[PDB]
Amino acid sequence: PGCLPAYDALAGQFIEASSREARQAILKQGQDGLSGVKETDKKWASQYLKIMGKILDQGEDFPASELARISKLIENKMSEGKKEELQRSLNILTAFRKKGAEKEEL
């Protein structure tokens, strides 16, 4: 459910973009193309656009700290449903940071 193909492409372009205004434009283009996304993946990508928006506002260490927080939540007395959602968030934020690593390599 997380780490969607479209999300990965948007995350890659998001990170590679230097200007914050350009990053906003990229998020807008994602929202524009969102309408062409399969509903099942559209509802997810919609949230993921908001997540990348939160990353932009809160800085590139936001998703890094959140990812660590997800790991901490996983290492706890969580339900099966909570664990699944945590793994979802893990894949989302890890995918972002993966594109960050690739961007740095480039």
Side-chain angles (χ1 to χ4, degrees):
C3 188
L4 296 175
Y7 169 70
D8 288 348
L10 290 171
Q13 290 175 355
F14 174 90
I15 293 168
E16 286 170 356
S18 178
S19 173
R20 291 177 182 174
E21 290 175 356
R23 286 178 170 179
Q24 287 173 355
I26 291 168
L27 292 172
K28 288 178 181 181
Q29 287 175 358
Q31 184 175 0
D32 287 347
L34 186 62
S35 67
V37 177
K38 181 177 179 178
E39 183 177 359
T40 298
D41 297 312
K42 183 181 177 187
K43 291 179 181 179
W44 294 333
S46 182
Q47 184 63 47
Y48 302 175
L49 287 168
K50 291 180 180 180
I51 291 170
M52 288 188 282
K54 289 178 182 179
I55 292 169
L56 185 60
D57 288 347
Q58 298 300 312
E60 294 173 6
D61 297 312
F62 170 74
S65 294
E66 286 300 309
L67 180 60
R69 287 171 173 171
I70 292 297
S71 294
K72 289 178 181 181
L73 290 170
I74 291 168
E75 298 172 358
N76 214 340
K77 294 183 180 179
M78 301 297 174
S79 71
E80 289 175 356
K82 288 181 181 180
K83 287 178 179 179
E84 287 170 355
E85 288 304 311
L86 287 169
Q87 286 173 358
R88 182 177 67 82
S89 294
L90 191 157
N91 287 339
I92 293 164
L93 295 173
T94 296
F96 183 86
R97 296 301 294 165
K98 181 178 178 182
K99 287 295 178 182
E102 290 175 358
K103 186 265 191 176
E104 289 171 356
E105 288 171 355
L106 291 172

XYZ file of all heavy atoms in Angstrom:
825
model
N 0.824 -1.203 0.000
C 0.000 0.000 0.000
C 0.860 1.257 0.000
O 0.490 2.274 -0.586
C -0.842 -0.123 1.274
C -0.025 -0.983 2.177
C 0.670 -1.964 1.272
N 2.011 1.180 0.660
C 2.959 2.288 0.681
C 3.973 2.166 -0.448
O 3.894 1.254 -1.271
N 4.928 3.090 -0.482
C 5.975 3.074 -1.496
C 5.397 2.807 -2.880
O 5.807 1.868 -3.564
C 6.859 1.910 -1.048
S 8.409 1.749 -1.968
N 4.444 3.638 -3.288
C 3.818 3.501 -4.598
C 4.746 3.983 -5.705
O 5.573 4.870 -5.493
C 2.494 4.275 -4.636
C 1.414 3.766 -3.672
C 0.200 4.685 -3.718
C 1.027 2.343 -4.046
N 4.603 3.395 -6.888
C 5.403 3.790 -8.042
C 5.325 5.293 -8.277
O 6.345 5.953 -8.474
C 4.803 2.993 -9.204
C 4.222 1.780 -8.561
C 3.683 2.250 -7.236
N 4.109 5.828 -8.256
C 3.897 7.256 -8.459
C 4.516 8.071 -7.330
O 5.120 9.117 -7.565
C 2.411 7.560 -8.582
N 4.362 7.585 -6.103
C 4.950 8.239 -4.940
C 6.469 8.292 -5.048
O 7.090 9.297 -4.703
C 4.540 7.516 -3.655
C 5.308 7.961 -2.430
C 5.106 9.219 -1.881
C 6.229 7.121 -1.825
C 5.804 9.631 -0.762
C 6.933 7.522 -0.706
C 6.718 8.778 -0.177
O 7.416 9.182 0.938
N 7.061 7.204 -5.528
C 8.511 7.110 -5.644
C 9.048 8.099 -6.672
O 10.077 8.737 -6.454
C 8.928 5.686 -6.019
C 8.769 4.668 -4.897
O 8.560 5.074 -3.778
O 8.700 3.498 -5.189
N 8.342 8.221 -7.791
C 8.711 9.178 -8.828
C 8.593 10.610 -8.324
O 9.468 11.440 -8.569
C 7.850 8.975 -10.067
N 7.503 10.895 -7.618
C 7.270 12.227 -7.072
C 8.272 12.554 -5.971
O 8.721 13.692 -5.846
C 5.836 12.338 -6.540
C 4.740 12.345 -7.613
C 3.370 12.224 -6.960
C 4.837 13.625 -8.431
N 8.616 11.547 -5.175
C 9.586 11.719 -4.099
C 10.984 11.966 -4.652
O 11.738 12.779 -4.119
C 9.581 10.505 -3.183
N 11.324 11.259 -5.724
C 12.620 11.422 -6.371
C 12.785 12.832 -6.924
O 13.803 13.484 -6.694
N 11.777 13.297 -7.655
C 11.787 14.648 -8.202
C 11.739 15.692 -7.095
O 12.423 16.712 -7.160
C 10.606 14.849 -9.155
C 10.721 14.083 -10.461
C 9.478 14.212 -11.320
O 8.478 14.805 -10.905
N 9.530 13.652 -12.523
N 10.924 15.430 -6.078
C 10.824 16.321 -4.928
C 12.191 16.575 -4.306
O 12.590 17.722 -4.107
C 9.870 15.740 -3.883
C 9.813 16.531 -2.607
C 8.891 17.555 -2.450
C 10.682 16.253 -1.563
C 8.839 18.284 -1.276
C 10.631 16.979 -0.388
C 9.707 17.996 -0.246
N 12.906 15.497 -4.002
C 14.190 15.597 -3.319
C 15.241 16.241 -4.215
O 16.004 17.100 -3.774
C 14.695 14.217 -2.860
C 13.783 13.651 -1.769
C 16.129 14.314 -2.363
C 14.028 12.190 -1.466
N 15.276 15.818 -5.474
C 16.263 16.320 -6.423
C 16.115 17.822 -6.630
O 17.103 18.534 -6.804
C 16.138 15.591 -7.762
C 16.661 14.161 -7.750
C 16.286 13.432 -9.011
O 15.591 13.999 -9.819
O 16.787 12.352 -9.219
N 14.875 18.297 -6.609
C 14.599 19.725 -6.715
C 15.196 20.490 -5.540
O 15.000 20.120 -4.383
C 13.100 19.971 -6.805
N 15.925 21.558 -5.845
C 16.565 22.367 -4.815
C 15.603 23.409 -4.257
O 15.405 23.499 -3.045
C 17.804 23.039 -5.374
O 18.428 23.864 -4.429
N 15.008 24.196 -5.148
C 14.093 25.257 -4.743
C 12.853 24.686 -4.069
O 12.247 23.735 -4.563
C 13.704 26.095 -5.945
O 12.701 27.024 -5.635
N 12.478 25.273 -2.937
C 11.276 24.861 -2.222
C 10.020 25.184 -3.021
O 9.034 24.448 -2.971
C 11.211 25.452 -0.821
C 12.237 24.897 0.155
C 12.211 25.533 1.497
N 13.215 25.031 2.421
C 13.449 25.539 3.647
N 12.783 26.583 4.086
N 14.387 24.974 4.389
N 10.063 26.288 -3.759
C 8.962 26.664 -4.639
C 8.798 25.663 -5.775
O 7.679 25.338 -6.171
C 9.185 28.068 -5.205
C 9.048 29.187 -4.182
C 9.393 30.522 -4.782
O 9.786 30.555 -5.923
O 9.157 31.518 -4.140
N 9.919 25.176 -6.295
C 9.902 24.120 -7.301
C 9.343 22.824 -6.730
O 8.627 22.092 -7.412
C 11.300 23.898 -7.859
N 9.674 22.546 -5.473
C 9.158 21.366 -4.789
C 7.648 21.451 -4.606
O 6.942 20.450 -4.720
C 9.866 21.114 -3.466
C 11.280 20.570 -3.590
C 11.978 20.374 -2.294
N 13.231 19.643 -2.388
C 14.041 19.376 -1.345
N 13.756 19.809 -0.137
N 15.146 18.686 -1.573
N 7.159 22.654 -4.321
C 5.724 22.899 -4.251
C 5.059 22.675 -5.603
O 3.982 22.083 -5.686
C 5.448 24.327 -3.771
C 5.734 24.554 -2.296
C 5.614 26.014 -1.902
O 5.396 26.885 -2.749
N 5.761 26.291 -0.611
N 5.707 23.150 -6.661
C 5.205 22.958 -8.017
C 5.121 21.477 -8.368
O 4.172 21.037 -9.017
C 6.085 23.693 -9.017
N 6.118 20.714 -7.935
C 6.131 19.272 -8.155
C 4.963 18.596 -7.447
O 4.312 17.714 -8.006
C 7.448 18.638 -7.672
C 8.610 19.076 -8.568
C 7.331 17.122 -7.649
C 9.974 18.748 -8.002
N 4.703 19.017 -6.214
C 3.582 18.488 -5.445
C 2.251 18.846 -6.095
O 1.301 18.066 -6.054
C 3.632 19.016 -4.005
C 4.795 18.486 -3.156
C 4.846 19.221 -1.824
C 4.627 16.989 -2.939
N 2.190 20.031 -6.694
C 1.005 20.460 -7.424
C 0.790 19.615 -8.673
O -0.339 19.257 -9.006
C 1.112 21.938 -7.800
C 0.965 22.899 -6.627
C 1.129 24.344 -7.072
C 1.013 25.303 -5.895
N 1.150 26.723 -6.319
N 1.883 19.301 -9.363
C 1.824 18.445 -10.542
C 1.388 17.032 -10.176
O 0.674 16.377 -10.934
C 3.186 18.401 -11.240
C 3.544 19.674 -11.986
C 4.952 19.638 -12.550
O 5.688 18.667 -12.357
N 5.336 20.700 -13.249
N 1.822 16.568 -9.009
C 1.382 15.281 -8.486
C -0.116 15.279 -8.214
O -0.815 14.320 -8.544
N -0.605 16.357 -7.612
C -2.029 16.501 -7.335
C -2.836 16.583 -8.624
O -3.960 16.087 -8.697
C -2.287 17.747 -6.484
C -3.736 17.928 -6.066
C -3.927 19.108 -5.132
O -2.968 19.804 -4.786
N -5.167 19.336 -4.715
N -2.255 17.213 -9.640
C -2.893 17.307 -10.948
C -2.975 15.943 -11.620
O -3.994 15.595 -12.217
C -2.135 18.289 -11.844
C -2.325 19.754 -11.474
O -3.210 20.042 -10.704
O -1.493 20.550 -11.837
N -1.898 15.172 -11.519
C -1.852 13.837 -12.104
C -2.567 12.824 -11.220
O -2.859 11.708 -11.650
N -2.849 13.219 -9.983
C -3.552 12.354 -9.044
C -4.878 11.877 -9.622
O -5.305 10.750 -9.372
C -3.782 13.089 -7.717
C -4.395 12.238 -6.597
C -3.458 11.092 -6.241
C -4.663 13.113 -5.382
N -5.526 12.741 -10.396
C -6.837 12.435 -10.955
C -6.759 11.278 -11.942
O -7.765 10.635 -12.240
C -7.418 13.664 -11.627
O -6.687 14.038 -12.762
N -5.558 11.018 -12.446
C -5.349 9.949 -13.416
C -4.864 8.675 -12.736
O -4.525 7.695 -13.400
N -4.832 8.694 -11.408
C -4.380 7.543 -10.635
C -5.549 6.648 -10.246
O -6.602 7.130 -9.830
C -3.631 7.977 -9.361
C -3.228 6.762 -8.540
C -2.409 8.807 -9.718
N -5.356 5.340 -10.382
C -6.364 4.370 -9.970
C -6.847 4.646 -8.552
O -6.044 4.851 -7.642
C -5.810 2.948 -10.070
C -6.798 1.859 -9.672
C -6.200 0.473 -9.862
C -7.174 -0.614 -9.430
N -6.624 -1.978 -9.662
N -8.163 4.650 -8.371
C -8.764 5.107 -7.124
C -8.106 4.444 -5.921
O -7.858 5.090 -4.902
C -10.269 4.830 -7.120
C -10.997 5.329 -5.881
C -12.478 5.089 -5.983
O -12.909 4.578 -6.989
O -13.164 5.313 -5.014
N -7.826 3.151 -6.044
C -7.214 2.393 -4.959
C -5.879 2.998 -4.548
O -5.562 3.082 -3.361
C -7.000 0.919 -5.350
O -8.267 0.303 -5.614
C -6.297 0.167 -4.230
N -5.098 3.421 -5.536
C -3.797 4.028 -5.279
C -3.913 5.542 -5.148
O -2.998 6.203 -4.655
C -2.809 3.671 -6.392
C -2.507 2.184 -6.511
O -2.225 1.572 -5.508
O -2.713 1.639 -7.570
N -5.041 6.085 -5.593
C -5.257 7.526 -5.571
C -5.459 8.033 -4.149
O -4.881 9.044 -3.751
C -6.461 7.901 -6.438
C -6.722 9.398 -6.540
C -7.951 9.688 -7.386
C -8.259 11.178 -7.424
N -9.551 11.463 -8.105
N -6.283 7.322 -3.385
C -6.541 7.681 -1.996
C -5.263 7.636 -1.169
O -5.066 8.450 -0.266
C -7.594 6.753 -1.389
C -8.996 6.937 -1.954
C -9.980 5.965 -1.320
C -11.377 6.137 -1.897
N -12.344 5.171 -1.309
N -4.395 6.679 -1.481
C -3.099 6.575 -0.822
C -2.178 7.716 -1.235
O -1.586 8.385 -0.389
C -2.444 5.230 -1.144
C -3.179 4.055 -0.572
C -3.970 4.050 0.538
C -3.191 2.716 -1.082
N -4.474 2.791 0.753
C -4.011 1.954 -0.230
C -2.588 2.088 -2.179
C -4.242 0.602 -0.436
C -2.821 0.734 -2.385
C -3.625 0.012 -1.539
N -2.062 7.932 -2.541
C -1.156 8.944 -3.072
C -1.558 10.339 -2.613
O -0.711 11.214 -2.435
C -1.113 8.874 -4.591
N -2.858 10.542 -2.424
C -3.369 11.803 -1.899
C -2.764 12.118 -0.537
O -2.306 13.235 -0.294
C -4.882 11.756 -1.807
O -5.418 12.964 -1.342
N -2.765 11.128 0.349
C -2.152 11.276 1.663
C -0.645 11.469 1.551
O -0.052 12.246 2.299
C -2.452 10.053 2.535
C -1.928 10.158 3.957
C -2.580 11.287 4.731
O -3.805 11.442 4.717
N -1.765 12.086 5.410
N -0.031 10.759 0.611
C 1.418 10.789 0.452
C 1.887 12.140 -0.071
O 2.998 12.580 0.224
C 1.876 9.674 -0.491
C 1.487 8.286 -0.034
C 1.744 7.178 -0.828
C 0.864 8.087 1.189
C 1.391 5.908 -0.415
C 0.507 6.821 1.612
C 0.773 5.733 0.806
O 0.418 4.470 1.221
N 1.032 12.797 -0.849
C 1.272 14.176 -1.257
C 1.287 15.112 -0.055
O 2.131 16.004 0.039
C 0.208 14.623 -2.267
C 0.350 14.026 -3.673
C -0.911 14.294 -4.483
C 1.568 14.625 -4.358
N 0.351 14.902 0.864
C 0.299 15.679 2.096
C 1.517 15.410 2.970
O 2.024 16.310 3.638
C -0.983 15.369 2.871
C -2.257 15.879 2.211
C -3.487 15.530 3.035
C -4.760 16.039 2.375
N -5.971 15.712 3.176
N 1.982 14.166 2.961
C 3.164 13.783 3.724
C 4.406 14.500 3.211
O 5.205 15.015 3.993
C 3.402 12.263 3.673
C 2.313 11.526 4.456
C 4.779 11.923 4.222
C 2.324 10.027 4.254
N 4.563 14.531 1.892
C 5.692 15.214 1.270
C 5.604 16.720 1.473
O 6.623 17.406 1.551
C 5.752 14.884 -0.220
C 6.204 13.464 -0.533
S 6.472 13.191 -2.296
C 4.786 12.998 -2.869
N 4.380 17.230 1.558
C 4.154 18.621 1.932
C 4.634 18.894 3.352
O 5.271 19.914 3.617
N 4.323 17.978 4.262
C 4.780 18.084 5.643
C 6.299 17.997 5.729
O 6.924 18.672 6.548
C 4.142 16.993 6.504
C 2.655 17.192 6.771
C 2.081 16.041 7.584
C 0.588 16.219 7.817
N 0.009 15.094 8.600
N 6.888 17.163 4.879
C 8.339 17.063 4.785
C 8.955 18.383 4.341
O 9.938 18.846 4.918
C 8.767 15.953 3.808
C 8.396 14.577 4.367
C 10.260 16.034 3.532
C 8.545 13.451 3.369
N 8.371 18.985 3.310
C 8.846 20.267 2.802
C 8.833 21.331 3.892
O 9.791 22.089 4.044
C 7.990 20.715 1.610
C 8.470 21.990 0.905
C 9.879 21.790 0.365
C 7.507 22.341 -0.220
N 7.743 21.382 4.650
C 7.569 22.404 5.675
C 8.467 22.138 6.877
O 9.047 23.061 7.447
C 6.106 22.476 6.118
C 5.169 23.101 5.092
O 5.653 23.699 4.161
O 3.990 22.843 5.160
N 8.575 20.869 7.258
C 9.212 20.499 8.516
C 10.674 20.128 8.306
O 11.404 19.876 9.265
C 8.470 19.328 9.168
C 7.025 19.630 9.528
C 6.902 20.773 10.517
O 7.593 20.805 11.539
N 6.015 21.717 10.222
N 11.097 20.098 7.047
C 12.499 19.885 6.715
C 12.760 18.435 6.327
O 11.909 17.567 6.523
N 13.942 18.178 5.776
C 14.250 16.877 5.196
C 14.622 15.867 6.274
O 14.806 14.683 5.993
C 15.385 16.999 4.176
C 15.035 17.822 2.943
C 16.241 18.036 2.071
O 17.268 17.472 2.360
O 16.106 18.672 1.052
N 14.733 16.343 7.510
C 14.965 15.465 8.651
C 13.653 15.054 9.306
O 13.639 14.247 10.235
C 15.873 16.148 9.676
C 17.275 16.459 9.167
O 17.886 15.585 8.599
O 17.660 17.602 9.210
N 12.552 15.614 8.817
C 11.232 15.300 9.350
C 10.891 13.829 9.150
O 10.523 13.133 10.097
C 10.168 16.180 8.691
C 8.759 15.767 9.008
C 8.209 16.023 10.256
C 7.980 15.120 8.061
C 6.913 15.642 10.548
C 6.683 14.739 8.350
C 6.150 15.001 9.596
N 11.018 13.360 7.913
C 10.680 11.982 7.578
C 11.688 11.008 8.171
O 11.369 9.845 8.422
C 10.684 11.957 6.046
C 11.625 13.047 5.660
C 11.402 14.143 6.668
N 12.908 11.487 8.392
C 13.938 10.689 9.044
C 13.591 10.427 10.504
O 13.687 9.296 10.982
C 15.291 11.376 8.932
N 13.190 11.479 11.209
C 12.782 11.357 12.604
C 11.490 10.559 12.732
O 11.334 9.757 13.652
C 12.618 12.731 13.222
O 13.836 13.418 13.309
N 10.567 10.785 11.804
C 9.300 10.063 11.792
C 9.515 8.577 11.539
O 8.850 7.733 12.140
C 8.362 10.646 10.733
C 7.744 11.985 11.110
C 6.934 11.877 12.372
O 6.109 10.999 12.453
O 7.218 12.599 13.299
N 10.448 8.263 10.646
C 10.793 6.876 10.354
C 11.329 6.170 11.593
O 10.959 5.031 11.878
C 11.821 6.814 9.218
C 12.274 5.402 8.824
C 11.078 4.576 8.372
C 13.317 5.492 7.719
N 12.203 6.853 12.326
C 12.702 6.340 13.596
C 11.570 6.143 14.595
O 11.558 5.172 15.351
C 13.758 7.276 14.166
N 10.617 7.070 14.592
C 9.463 6.984 15.479
C 8.599 5.775 15.144
O 8.072 5.111 16.036
C 8.647 8.268 15.484
C 9.288 9.431 16.225
C 8.595 10.732 16.040
N 9.113 11.812 16.864
C 8.751 13.105 16.746
N 7.903 13.489 15.818
N 9.291 13.982 17.574
N 8.455 5.497 13.853
C 7.722 4.321 13.400
C 8.371 3.038 13.904
O 7.689 2.132 14.382
C 7.631 4.268 11.864
C 6.748 5.405 11.343
C 7.095 2.921 11.408
C 5.313 5.328 11.812
N 9.694 2.968 13.796
C 10.444 1.823 14.297
C 10.236 1.642 15.795
O 10.082 0.520 16.279
C 11.918 1.987 13.984
O 12.173 1.943 12.607
N 10.234 2.751 16.526
C 10.015 2.720 17.967
C 8.609 2.235 18.298
O 8.405 1.509 19.272
C 10.250 4.103 18.575
C 11.708 4.540 18.597
C 11.858 5.943 19.166
C 13.312 6.394 19.155
N 13.474 7.760 19.724
N 7.641 2.640 17.483
C 6.257 2.216 17.666
C 6.094 0.730 17.375
O 5.326 0.038 18.043
C 5.327 3.041 16.768
C 5.167 4.513 17.171
C 4.426 5.276 16.082
C 4.421 4.599 18.494
N 6.820 0.245 16.375
C 6.805 -1.173 16.033
C 7.341 -2.022 17.179
O 6.794 -3.081 17.489
C 7.629 -1.458 14.765
C 6.938 -0.867 13.534
C 7.840 -2.955 14.594
C 7.806 -0.846 12.297
N 8.414 -1.551 17.805
C 8.971 -2.217 18.976
C 8.153 -1.913 20.224
O 8.644 -1.282 21.161
C 10.428 -1.798 19.188
C 11.363 -2.175 18.046
C 12.727 -1.573 18.235
O 12.912 -0.858 19.191
O 13.613 -1.913 17.489
N 6.903 -2.364 20.231
C 5.996 -2.092 21.340
C 4.789 -3.020 21.304
O 4.653 -3.841 20.398
C 5.545 -0.643 21.346
C 5.345 -0.077 22.725
O 5.183 -0.816 23.703
N 5.275 1.227 22.795
N 3.914 -2.883 22.295
C 2.720 -3.715 22.383
C 1.624 -3.206 21.457
O 0.605 -2.686 21.913
C 2.210 -3.767 23.824
C 3.151 -4.460 24.801
C 2.543 -4.541 26.193
C 3.485 -5.230 27.170
N 2.915 -5.289 28.543
N 1.838 -3.359 20.155
C 0.869 -2.911 19.161
C 0.029 -4.074 18.650
O 0.457 -5.228 18.690
C 1.583 -2.224 17.999
C 2.407 -1.007 18.397
S 1.396 0.323 19.076
C 2.663 1.476 19.600
N -1.172 -3.764 18.170
C -2.027 -4.764 17.543
C -1.538 -5.108 16.142
O -0.657 -4.441 15.601
C -3.460 -4.269 17.496
O -3.627 -3.226 16.575
N -2.117 -6.153 15.559
C -1.753 -6.576 14.212
C -2.063 -5.490 13.190
O -1.282 -5.250 12.269
C -2.483 -7.870 13.842
C -1.997 -9.103 14.592
C -2.831 -10.308 14.259
O -3.787 -10.165 13.535
O -2.450 -11.392 14.635
N -3.207 -4.836 13.359
C -3.602 -3.745 12.476
C -2.644 -2.566 12.594
O -2.261 -1.961 11.592
N -2.260 -2.244 13.824
C -1.317 -1.161 14.073
C 0.049 -1.470 13.474
O 0.709 -0.591 12.919
C -1.185 -0.898 15.574
C -2.398 -0.226 16.204
C -2.186 0.016 17.691
C -3.405 0.671 18.325
N -3.212 0.914 19.780
N 0.470 -2.725 13.590
C 1.747 -3.159 13.038
C 1.758 -3.044 11.519
O 2.763 -2.653 10.924
C 2.051 -4.598 13.458
C 2.459 -4.754 14.917
C 2.688 -6.215 15.274
C 3.119 -6.370 16.725
N 3.313 -7.798 17.099
N 0.636 -3.387 10.896
C 0.502 -3.288 9.448
C 0.589 -1.840 8.984
O 1.242 -1.536 7.986
C -0.819 -3.908 8.988
C -0.856 -5.429 9.053
C -2.245 -5.953 8.811
O -3.146 -5.158 8.692
O -2.388 -7.139 8.633
N -0.073 -0.949 9.714
C -0.053 0.473 9.392
C 1.327 1.072 9.629
O 1.760 1.964 8.900
C -1.102 1.223 10.216
C -2.540 0.965 9.789
C -2.745 1.285 8.335
O -2.342 2.344 7.917
O -3.202 0.427 7.617
N 2.014 0.578 10.654
C 3.370 1.020 10.952
C 4.340 0.598 9.856
O 5.214 1.368 9.457
C 3.823 0.465 12.308
C 3.176 1.125 13.532
C 3.493 0.322 14.787
C 3.680 2.555 13.665
N 4.181 -0.629 9.372
C 4.995 -1.130 8.271
C 4.714 -0.362 6.985
O 5.616 -0.130 6.180
C 4.737 -2.623 8.049
C 5.349 -3.524 9.107
C 4.935 -4.974 8.942
O 4.146 -5.312 8.055
N 5.462 -5.841 9.799
N 3.458 0.029 6.798
C 3.081 0.884 5.680
C 3.816 2.217 5.734
O 4.426 2.641 4.753
C 1.575 1.082 5.591
C 1.110 1.934 4.420
C -0.365 2.063 4.305
N -0.990 2.813 5.383
C -1.062 4.157 5.439
N -0.519 4.903 4.503
N -1.674 4.707 6.473
N 3.753 2.875 6.887
C 4.443 4.145 7.083
C 5.953 3.976 6.963
O 6.647 4.858 6.457
C 4.083 4.731 8.434
O 2.731 5.088 8.510
N 6.454 2.838 7.430
C 7.873 2.523 7.317
C 8.316 2.485 5.860
O 9.330 3.079 5.494
C 8.175 1.184 8.002
C 9.665 0.864 8.181
C 9.852 -0.129 9.320
C 10.225 0.306 6.881
N 7.549 1.784 5.032
C 7.865 1.660 3.615
C 7.782 3.009 2.912
O 8.580 3.307 2.023
C 6.957 0.656 2.929
C 7.266 -0.774 3.277
O 8.374 -1.103 3.714
N 6.318 -1.637 3.010
N 6.812 3.822 3.316
C 6.634 5.150 2.739
C 7.847 6.034 3.010
O 8.414 6.622 2.090
C 5.374 5.841 3.289
C 4.116 5.107 2.820
C 5.335 7.299 2.857
C 2.870 5.472 3.596
N 8.237 6.122 4.277
C 9.302 7.028 4.688
C 10.668 6.492 4.281
O 11.577 7.258 3.961
C 9.248 7.256 6.204
C 7.992 7.974 6.712
C 7.976 7.985 8.235
C 7.960 9.393 6.163
N 10.808 5.170 4.296
C 12.038 4.524 3.852
C 12.253 4.722 2.357
O 13.377 4.949 1.907
C 12.029 3.017 4.164
O 11.984 2.821 5.584
C 13.275 2.349 3.603
N 11.172 4.632 1.591
C 11.227 4.877 0.155
C 11.688 6.298 -0.145
O 12.492 6.522 -1.050
C 9.871 4.611 -0.481
N 11.174 7.255 0.621
C 11.595 8.645 0.495
C 13.084 8.797 0.775
O 13.814 9.410 -0.006
C 10.788 9.535 1.441
C 11.119 10.996 1.330
C 10.488 11.795 0.388
C 12.063 11.573 2.166
C 10.793 13.140 0.285
C 12.369 12.917 2.066
C 11.733 13.701 1.124
N 13.532 8.237 1.894
C 14.926 8.348 2.301
C 15.837 7.563 1.366
O 17.016 7.884 1.217
C 15.135 7.940 3.753
C 14.427 8.818 4.772
C 14.820 10.250 4.723
N 16.199 10.510 5.103
C 16.857 11.659 4.856
N 16.281 12.642 4.200
N 18.107 11.764 5.271
N 15.283 6.532 0.736
C 16.003 5.783 -0.288
C 16.279 6.649 -1.510
O 17.383 6.636 -2.055
C 15.214 4.537 -0.693
C 15.893 3.680 -1.753
C 15.068 2.444 -2.076
C 15.720 1.614 -3.174
N 14.898 0.428 -3.536
N 15.270 7.400 -1.938
C 15.431 8.348 -3.034
C 16.390 9.471 -2.654
O 17.077 10.027 -3.509
C 14.077 8.929 -3.444
C 13.179 7.957 -4.198
C 13.786 7.568 -5.538
C 12.912 6.561 -6.271
N 13.515 6.139 -7.564
N 16.429 9.798 -1.367
C 17.396 10.758 -0.850
C 18.820 10.236 -0.991
O 19.715 10.957 -1.431
N 19.023 8.978 -0.613
C 20.326 8.339 -0.750
C 20.768 8.296 -2.207
O 21.927 8.564 -2.523
C 20.292 6.936 -0.161
N 19.838 7.953 -3.092
C 20.123 7.899 -4.521
C 20.454 9.282 -5.070
O 21.361 9.435 -5.888
C 18.937 7.302 -5.282
C 18.727 5.812 -5.047
C 17.484 5.321 -5.737
O 16.809 6.118 -6.342
O 17.271 4.132 -5.756
N 19.712 10.286 -4.615
C 19.968 11.666 -5.010
C 21.367 12.106 -4.600
O 22.056 12.795 -5.351
C 18.923 12.600 -4.397
C 19.018 14.045 -4.868
C 19.847 14.886 -3.908
C 19.722 16.370 -4.222
N 20.449 17.211 -3.233
N 21.782 11.703 -3.403
C 23.113 12.027 -2.905
C 24.192 11.320 -3.716
O 25.255 11.883 -3.979
C 23.238 11.653 -1.427
C 22.452 12.552 -0.483
C 22.450 12.004 0.918
O 22.968 10.932 1.117
O 22.030 12.706 1.808
N 23.912 10.082 -4.111
C 24.831 9.320 -4.948
C 24.985 9.960 -6.322
O 26.079 9.982 -6.887
C 24.348 7.874 -5.094
C 24.504 7.031 -3.836
C 23.813 5.703 -3.981
O 23.170 5.495 -4.982
O 24.017 4.856 -3.144
N 23.885 10.482 -6.853
C 23.907 11.168 -8.139
C 24.697 12.468 -8.057
O 25.896 12.445 -8.104
C 22.476 11.443 -8.618
C 21.669 10.199 -9.012
C 20.219 10.580 -9.277
C 22.292 9.558 -10.243
